[PDB]
Amino acid sequence: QAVSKQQYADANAAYLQSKAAVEQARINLRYTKVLSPISGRIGRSAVTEGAL
Amino acid sequence: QAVSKQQYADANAAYLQSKAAVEQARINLRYTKVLSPISGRIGRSAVTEGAL
Numbered sequence: 299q300a301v302s303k304q305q306y307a308d309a310n311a312a313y314l315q316s317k318a319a320v321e322q323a324r325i326n327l328r329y330t331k332v333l334s335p336i337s338g339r340i341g342r343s344a345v346t347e348g349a350l
Numbered sequence: 351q352a353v354s355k356q357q358y359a360d361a362n363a364a365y366l367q368s369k370a371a372v373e374q375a376r377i378n379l380r381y382t383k384v385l386s387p388i389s390g391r392i393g394r395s396a397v398t399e400g401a402l
Contacts, residue, residue: 299355 334340386392 299351302354302357303351
């Protein structure tokens with residue numbers, strides 16, 4: 299009873315939001331490493347080194 | 351659980367303080383009417399109207 303159910307709610311609420319954000323952050327970081335969709339023969343690269 | 355035991359405590363706390371104050375207020379007010387302790391021949395009022 300040291301704290302209202304509301305407070306604990308708001309708390310666990312933010313906690314979930316965070317846990318969410320981190321997972322999304324993790325995924326984007328991982329993608330800074332583009333990978334090969336399939337096995338095959340790759341050709342000319344349309345994008346150049348250092349392009350946007 | 352809508353509110354902490356602490357809050358309800360502080361609440362009921364003030365409530366008691368109030369109830370206390372009122373009772374004391376009541377008593378002082380009551381004492382403003384100076385009544386005679388007994389019946390009989392009273393004498394000179396060794397105190398004049400307006401005097402503290």
